[PDB]
Amino acid sequence: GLLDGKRILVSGIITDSSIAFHIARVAQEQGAQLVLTGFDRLRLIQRITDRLPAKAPLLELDVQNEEHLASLAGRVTEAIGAGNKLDGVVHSIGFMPQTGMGINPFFDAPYADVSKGIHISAYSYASMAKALLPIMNPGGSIVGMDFDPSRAMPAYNWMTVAKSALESVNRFVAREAGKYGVRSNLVAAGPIRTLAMSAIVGGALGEEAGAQIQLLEEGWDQRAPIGWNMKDATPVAKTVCALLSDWLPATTGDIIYADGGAHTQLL
Amino acid sequence: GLLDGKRILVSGIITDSSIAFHIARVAQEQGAQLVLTGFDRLRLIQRITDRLPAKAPLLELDVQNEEHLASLAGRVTEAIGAGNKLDGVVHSIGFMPQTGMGINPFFDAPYADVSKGIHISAYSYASMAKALLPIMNPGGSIVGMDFDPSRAMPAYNWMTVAKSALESVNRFVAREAGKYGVRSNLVAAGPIRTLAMSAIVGGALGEEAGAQIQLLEEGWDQRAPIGWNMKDATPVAKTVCALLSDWLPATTGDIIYADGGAHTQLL
Amino acid sequence: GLLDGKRILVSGIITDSSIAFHIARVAQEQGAQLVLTGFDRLRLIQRITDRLPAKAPLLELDVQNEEHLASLAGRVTEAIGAGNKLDGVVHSIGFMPQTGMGINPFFDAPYADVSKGIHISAYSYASMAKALLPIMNPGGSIVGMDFDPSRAMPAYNWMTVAKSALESVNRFVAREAGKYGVRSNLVAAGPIRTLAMSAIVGGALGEEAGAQIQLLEEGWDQRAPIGWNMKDATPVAKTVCALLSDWLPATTGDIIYADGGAHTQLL
Amino acid sequence: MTGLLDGKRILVSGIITDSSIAFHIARVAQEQGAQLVLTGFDRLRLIQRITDRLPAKAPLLELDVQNEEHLASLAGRVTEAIGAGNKLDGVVHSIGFMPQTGMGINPFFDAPYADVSKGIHISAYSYASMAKALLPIMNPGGSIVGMDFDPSRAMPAYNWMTVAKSALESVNRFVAREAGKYGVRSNLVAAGPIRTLAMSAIVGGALGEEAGAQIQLLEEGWDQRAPIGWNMKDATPVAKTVCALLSDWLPATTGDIIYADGGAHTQL
Ligand SMILES: NC(=O)c1ccc[n+]([C@@H]2O[C@H](COP(=O)([O-])OP(=O)(O)OC[C@H]3O[C@@H](n4cnc5c(N)ncnc54)[C@H](O)[C@@H]3O)[C@@H](O)[C@H]2O)c1
Ligand SMILES: NC(=O)c1ccc[n+]([C@@H]2O[C@H](COP(=O)([O-])OP(=O)(O)OC[C@H]3O[C@@H](n4cnc5c(N)ncnc54)[C@H](O)[C@@H]3O)[C@@H](O)[C@H]2O)c1
Ligand SMILES: NC(=O)c1ccc[n+]([C@@H]2O[C@H](COP(=O)([O-])OP(=O)(O)OC[C@H]3O[C@@H](n4cnc5c(N)ncnc54)[C@H](O)[C@@H]3O)[C@@H](O)[C@H]2O)c1
Ligand SMILES: NC(=O)c1ccc[n+]([C@@H]2O[C@H](COP(=O)([O-])OP(=O)(O)OC[C@H]3O[C@@H](n4cnc5c(N)ncnc54)[C@H](O)[C@@H]3O)[C@@H](O)[C@H]2O)c1
Ligand SMILES: Cc1cc(=O)oc2cc(OCc3cn(Cc4ccc(Oc5ccccc5)c(O)c4)nn3)ccc12
Ligand SMILES: Cc1cc(=O)oc2cc(OCc3cn(Cc4ccc(Oc5ccccc5)c(O)c4)nn3)ccc12
Ligand SMILES: Cc1cc(=O)oc2cc(OCc3cn(Cc4ccc(Oc5ccccc5)c(O)c4)nn3)ccc12
Ligand SMILES: Cc1cc(=O)oc2cc(OCc3cn(Cc4ccc(Oc5ccccc5)c(O)c4)nn3)ccc12
Numbered sequence A, B, C: 001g002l003l004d005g006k007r008i009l010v011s012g013i014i015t016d017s018s019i020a021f022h023i024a025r026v027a028q029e030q031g032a033q034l035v036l037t038g039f040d041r042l043r044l045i046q047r048i049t050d051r052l053p054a055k056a057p058l059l060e061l062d063v064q065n066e067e068h069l070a071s072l073a074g075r076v077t078e079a080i081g082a083g084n085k086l087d088g089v090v091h092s093i094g095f096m097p098q099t100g101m102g103i104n105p106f107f108d109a110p111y112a113d114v115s116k117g118i119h120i121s122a123y124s125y126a127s128m129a130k131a132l133l134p135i136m137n138p139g140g141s142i143v144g145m146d147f148d149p150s151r152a153m154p155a156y157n158w159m160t161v162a163k164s165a166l167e168s169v170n171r172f173v174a175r176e177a178g179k180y181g182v183r184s185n186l187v188a189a190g191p192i193r194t195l196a197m198s199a200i201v202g203g204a205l206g207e208e209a210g211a212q213i214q215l216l217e218e219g220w221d222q223r224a225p226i227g228w229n230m231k232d233a234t235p236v237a238k239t240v241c242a243l244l245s246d247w248l249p250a251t252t253g254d255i256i257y258a259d260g261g262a263h264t265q266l267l
Numbered sequence D: 001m002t003g004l005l006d007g008k009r010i011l012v013s014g015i016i017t018d019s020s021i022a023f024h025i026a027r028v029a030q031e032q033g034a035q036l037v038l039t040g041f042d043r044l045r046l047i048q049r050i051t052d053r054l055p056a057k058a059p060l061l062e063l064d065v066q067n068e069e070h071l072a073s074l075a076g077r078v079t080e081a082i083g084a085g086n087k088l089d090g091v092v093h094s095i096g097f098m099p100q101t102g103m104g105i106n107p108f109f110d111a112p113y114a115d116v117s118k119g120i121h122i123s124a125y126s127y128a129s130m131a132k133a134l135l136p137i138m139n140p141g142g143s144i145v146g147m148d149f150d151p152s153r154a155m156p157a158y159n160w161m162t163v164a165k166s167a168l169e170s171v172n173r174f175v176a177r178e179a180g181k182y183g184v185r186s187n188l189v190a191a192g193p194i195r196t197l198a199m200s201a202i203v204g205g206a207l208g209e210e211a212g213a214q215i216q217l218l219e220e221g222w223d224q225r226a227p228i229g230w231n232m233k234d235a236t237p238v239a240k241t242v243c244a245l246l247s248d249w250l251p252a253t254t255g256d257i258i259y260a261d262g263g264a265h266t267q268l
Helices: A019-029 A042-049 A066-080 A111-135 A157-178 A195-223 A234-244 B019-029 B042-049 B066-080 B111-135 B157-178 B195-204 B206-223 B234-244 C019-029 C042-049 C066-080 C111-135 C157-178 C195-223 C234-244 D021-031 D044-051 D068-082 D113-137 D159-180 D197-225 D236-246
Strands: A007-011 A033-038 A058-060 A086-091 A136-146 A183-189 A254-258 B007-011 B033-038 B058-060 B086-091 B136-146 B183-189 B254-258 C007-011 C033-038 C058-060 C086-091 C136-146 C183-189 C254-258 D009-013 D035-040 D060-062 D088-093 D138-148 D185-191 D256-260
Touching (some): A007 A019, A019 A033, A019 A086, A019 A234, A033 A042, A033 A066, A042 A058, A058 A066, A086 A111, A086 A234, A111 A136, A111 A157, A111 B111, A136 A157, A136 A234, A157 B157, A234 A254, A254 C254, B007 B019, B019 B033, B019 B042, B019 B086, B019 B234, B033 B042, B033 B066, B042 B058, B058 B066, B086 B111, B086 B234, B111 B136, B111 B157, B136 B157, B136 B234, B157 B183, B157 B254, B183 B234, B195 B206, B234 B254, B254 D256, C019 C033, C033 C042, C033 C066, C042 C058, C058 C066, C066 C111, C086 C111, C086 C234, C111 C136, C111 C157, C111 D113, C111 D159, C136 C157, C136 C234, C157 C183, C157 C254, C157 D159, C183 C234, C234 C254, D009 D021, D021 D035, D035 D044, D060 D068, D088 D113, D088 D236, D113 D138, D113 D159, D138 D159, D138 D236, D159 D185, D185 D236
Parallel strands (some): A007 A033, A007 A086, A033 A058, A183 A254, B007 B033, B007 B086, B033 B058, B086 B136, C007 C033, C007 C086, C086 C136, C183 C254, D009 D035, D009 D088, D088 D138, D138 D185, D185 D256
16 A cells, blocks of 8 residues: 555546546555545536545535635545544646637737636645645645646647646745645646546647647657557556655655656657 | 847836846947837836937837737837838836735735736736737847746745746747747846846845845855856846847747856856 | 565665665565675675665676676576566666866866766666666666756766766666666755765865765755755655656656755755 | 957867858858867868868867867967967867767667767867866956757767767856856857768768658758757858857856757757
8 A cells, every 4th residue: 555544635536537536546546545626516526436446525626716725624624534634635637728728829818818727727736735734744745737848839838838837836835835844746747638638628729639639649659768658547647646655755846757758858 | 239220129117227228228239229118107217218328219018908919019110110120029027916925925925916927927928929920020039038937946936936937938939939930038137136126026025135135146146157246237138139139040939048157056 | 565576686885874775775675676786895795785674695796897797687687586587777876086076176087087987977877777678577667876967066076977977878778778668767866975975075075075065964955845864865765666666657767856855946 | 349259269179061060150250250260170181171161261270179188289279379468258169979889770778888988078078178278268258169969858869979968068067167267158059950071970870771861850850840940951040159159248148058959949
């Protein structure tokens, strides 16, 4: 049990393809006791989370809702029991309106759209850490999901901007989390076919979704020295669990790349 | 005449200490014909800009005002004359509310304040390029001001997140501007005593402002192999002019460090 | 056991303070079956390895001796039993002559000395992977020890160049290892009081050794959001074991920073 | 005053053919008023014919960066060429070499250290040894510029030259620490691909039958990646970037890398 006895809050399950679903599955297989947070369709998410290896309380969390955030630690504490604290927090949340993605012109995305995406995808990492650090044990770990935004790329558009914001937020979350003996890190994952990829990325690409996703999949697997499988979230979930474990105890404010080594190779 | 006969739009002048004031001064000393944009205190900005080596048309430009941005190209064309286009555009604009700066807790900055800062400091780089690219000549150059946000640091707080988003925005503006034969780059300057430093950073640092700024100047100057004088914007102004000129014609989506070499040295 | 049943080669032990000694100890506490390699003071190394939880075979390996490298895989197979292969390889080797370190002028290190340092510290990562890759199992992992060379610093001098070379070598060794299903990563560790730190770094600093090392420990701990203990190799050793495990299976050609997050913070 | 490098005395090393990056650096620097001192290696009679194709006449000095005597006499020979009492305002290092075993389709692991070490000596250590030799005859406000090819990520064919470029980048950061004492800047120009003798003879030669396909993929792929396009046949943009660094217009940039690659390294 890599996470045996650890109490871990995992956010971001929307379907069984979600990276958070696989983080939760691997974490439960490794002995973690989970609290899950879901957004919007809690009744559908409930149905999905029933397919996880073990039962886990499901709490509603809209990161844009200040009352959900203010009552969060209290709702987590009643779910895990008084006296118990969290050892891990998984932020696997992202959003960007379709206007800030795909073939929609980069300059045409209104700031209202971009700002909502930045709020959910980047600011929410600080807001979740602010709400959960008061109930985190020393030695704990906060992990957020990133997609390497160091270079501009096709389709990802304003989400790349949101991920660059996220990386910077992570380094500041590490400064605040250090006061609690808590580490804060991002897992920069390769492309995994999720509902976000299909509905947000795919949908915003339209006529170009097929070619772009094919080129992304073939190019990523070629670039990755050990290959990359866009339909297998397990290596990403295992990396998130390594950061939640006690086996990366000196890493904070950082980014672990679970991308097959793709970011290290030009071609 | 490094910028001889170039029509250059310079935004960001508020006082004679502004980085945009020194860029405007150096650019005019190099033969550039300027169009200056100012925000909020245009009567006072007219007084400051009257101190430049040559008088230049001053236009109002609030980067949050959609009408100012939509009318920008037409107002510039009216200033430079029909049939003329801009060769350079300088974005030297930044803002971050007090809550997102200094000794005020990072976690206590509301997203409304952070979003306002990201709008002005990062999104406006894309909205200014979108407004001005249709009126820019091939071979042109768009330059924005950055402050190395790759590592977290005391006091800079959410402005670091805005600069990280700005760096990502710049890489996407480079893609769009490339279609016009225009380069887009950021100049990451070392610290310079401007109104933004004293009023925004210093204001948010409270009683710890004098010591933190003195510590920053000494540290930066010690780390920089060629030294650093935060009272002198000229080295920074010259670096922006090098980017506006045809002497860096193969550089786009990039950050040029005008910081004394500080970011290349640990101690 | 995180490394249950894995056969791992650990090079680089000279004293019980060596980072490789703690990597070997932690790997053995986690079920790894080790094969140890040592250089020059084999008798001392044998006494040192007698302090490890389990007595592992000790193999002579001077990384500048082509006979030792050409016979390495055969000697390793004699040690771990024919029919058995390595699951992991740890490179924890470094050397730089005194002229290429400390207060000795950077410009005065003769190339013969710098080349020796680069050969042991950087090229040996590729020569070790070349010898051991044919006897490594798919899923295997090669880990090297690095010290963040992205920025110049005092005293490290030509060893910073050797580490920059090593980071590049690591990225190519990942291209080669990838075809065998083997990962290749580096652990950029924070400062640890080892024999190399006192004899090589401290030795080259002269009478400035205590003050410089005291400043390094204080500065590193100050910068690390989770703190840093120069007398504690265990967090570093734990990180190397995480890379040797199946829990980072999508990371290759990469660098994981086991430095307390110090590289992500300016101050 | 009249030219970006007016009145500056600049040493330019690395000219071998008129396609060399150093040749175009020399040409553009002379076009901007720089008085040059050129350095050449091995084929000095052939190089003298190449250096006569430049806009203005410049002295040509022999310099094998692996030769202690050429380095020890260098500042003296430069002082003789520019006149005593005059100093260099710039130094350009556009030198590189890596034996075939360390390049192309030759297996990365089979490159012997003797070969790799020669390449790192010529391509990375020499940047420090040239600075050590020329900093004592450089003026405050001076500038040392070296040539780099972005080694932050592994790539096909570049193999051990990537390792030398990584070492060079780290050397440049330390050369900045030393040059700073003299008020001199030290930077690299990470240029995009340019059709030079090194590309054809060393890279192409090491690529064997894959030379044409890899060069065509490199050429078109870089142009595509670069938001402003990239012309592998035009070294002028790179030459202008080196002159920009040798000028007084990047006065606060040291120990750094300026990318003259059309922006390609910023795009995935
Ligand atoms: N799928 C990939 O290839 C990939 C790669 C790298 C990083 N990521 C990151 O992984 C994370 C999860 O994405 P995914 O690919 O698993 O997709 P997904 O669609 O399964 O997950 C996105 C999640 O964000 C949640 N979310 C959106 N708005 C929210 C709000 N206001 N409040 C709370 N939750 C909200 C959704 O409910 C959903 O569970 C995101 O941060 C994403 O950017 C994904
Ligand atoms: N001063 C430094 O040390 C330093 C260092 C690195 C980068 N920078 C950057 O330089 C730029 C200019 O800052 P400065 O230091 O010269 O300070 P400054 O106060 O002189 O400049 C900031 C400018 O932003 C303008 N601005 C604010 N909100 C705006 C809006 N809504 N629309 C249009 N303009 C708006 C202000 O009117 C002012 O002219 C900023 O991007 C800043 O982050 C400054
Ligand atoms: N100590 C630190 O603070 C620190 C920090 C980051 C990285 N590192 C790296 O970790 C590694 C281990 O060093 P350490 O700090 O544990 O010091 P150490 O003195 O314990 O180990 C250095 C080892 O290198 C071996 N070595 C030297 N020349 C060799 C050769 N020719 N062939 C084979 N082995 C050879 C020595 O025998 C010794 O075992 C080195 O690569 C070092 O640069 C150390
Ligand atoms: N050509 C490109 O695409 C490209 C791209 C980026 C960087 N670079 C770098 O630019 C520099 C110049 O290369 P180039 O492309 O102009 O090729 P080139 O063949 O024209 O120049 C290489 C030069 O190095 C010289 N040299 C080799 N060994 C030497 C020694 N022992 N002493 C002195 N000089 C020596 C050669 O004589 C020649 O003048 C090299 O450092 C190269 O790595 C080239
Ligand atoms: C290199 C490359 C080659 C190519 O041919 O095409 C590309 C297309 C790309 O851009 C589009 C994209 C990003 N990804 C990975 C992902 C998918 C879902 C994510 O979750 C989200 C959650 C909310 C909002 C938006 C996204 C996410 O953050 C990352 N897949 N598709 C990126 C790179 C290339
Ligand atoms: C290393 C260090 C040591 C130390 O003791 O203290 C520090 C304080 C720092 O953070 C505070 C800061 C940043 N600077 C530089 C600047 C000043 C004005 C800017 O303009 C703005 C425009 C709008 C909004 C906000 C700022 C700007 O973008 C950057 N000066 N003050 C950063 C680093 C250290
Ligand atoms: C910021 C700072 C302040 C200060 O006052 O002083 C410093 C000295 C530093 O540079 C010197 C150094 C590096 N370290 C960490 C290490 C120690 C041993 C290693 O092993 C080796 C094996 C073979 C050869 C050389 C070293 C090693 O690779 C890294 N400790 N000392 C770096 C930074 C500062
Ligand atoms: C992106 C990409 C796509 C692709 O399909 O293929 C590639 C092949 C590459 O690697 C091979 C190479 C590097 N270049 C650029 C150069 C050419 C000459 C140089 O000068 C030297 C001086 C002495 C010794 C060796 C080289 C030099 O430093 C860099 N041209 N060929 C690199 C990148 C790609």
